[PDB]
């Protein structure tokens with residue numbers, strides 16, 4: 001049973017998605033050489049709780065001890081904010097935010113490049129966002145998720161990069177993770193024909209080297225097996241009658257919030 005959101009549910013998800021985007025807009029000017037990831041997480045959690053009057057879905061999730069996940073360079077996902085970990089020139093950094101507001105979740109992440117970019121870091125990030133945007137342009141009633149996952153994979157692999165298989169996007173609303181799974185690669189198991197009112201995330205994790213990953217002994221931090229760079233972007237969307245609506249769009253996105261077909 002994939003849940004179908006009511007109009008009221010969808011407006012709540014606009015609110016929550018807007019707050020999650022706004023955390024990312026807020027944190028931008030702090031993402032500078034020399035800042036700790038510990039400090040970035042405090043700035044985020046203080047903003048979520050004291051200004052947005054919302055809650056982080058990440059905090060305490062399976063015992064996770066911080067409020068956002070911050071994943072630098074070869075860290076693929078779930079990087080733990082750390083007062084001792086300082087950003088530096090050329091770093092690529094994912095900040096992943098999920099807020100709960102009025103009972104509903106907004107989930108989004110983006111890359112930041114710190115200081116002076118490296119060309120490869122810039123390319124990896126660009127192609128990862130472009131794979132998300134290609135997928136968003138496909139979402140409409142009647143399309144199969146499988147076609148989307150296949151398309152993401154084809155695009156990323158042509159650039160000589162790889163798609164992480166172990167993580168996927170997901171349904172979302174009153175639960176952080178709801179059906180369906182949104183694989184970013186082709187699988188004979190995927191057969192979900194989209195309908196208006198479905199809400200879910202698309203969030204490909206792309207490695208510059210090989211697809212395999214490894215979890216660290218801390219129980220949280222996931223890295224590329226080959227220590228290649230890895231990048232991720234994520235939006236929360238609703239399927240509309242003629243396409244979709246991006247609920248976590250930021251000023252810096254370069255795709256329209258409302259995508260119509262016909």
Ligand SMILES: O=C(NO)c1ncc(-c2ccccc2Cl)o1
Nearest residue numbers: 057058061064069078096107234
């Ligand atoms: O869909 C997600 N992010 O976009 C998500 N799923 C699981 C987790 C998680 C895993 C380990 C630590 C903290 C968190 Cl938030 O994040």
Ligand SMILES: [Mn+2]
Nearest residue numbers: 096097107108
């Ligand atoms: Mn997320």
Ligand SMILES: [Mn+2]
Nearest residue numbers: 107169201203
């Ligand atoms: Mn997610």
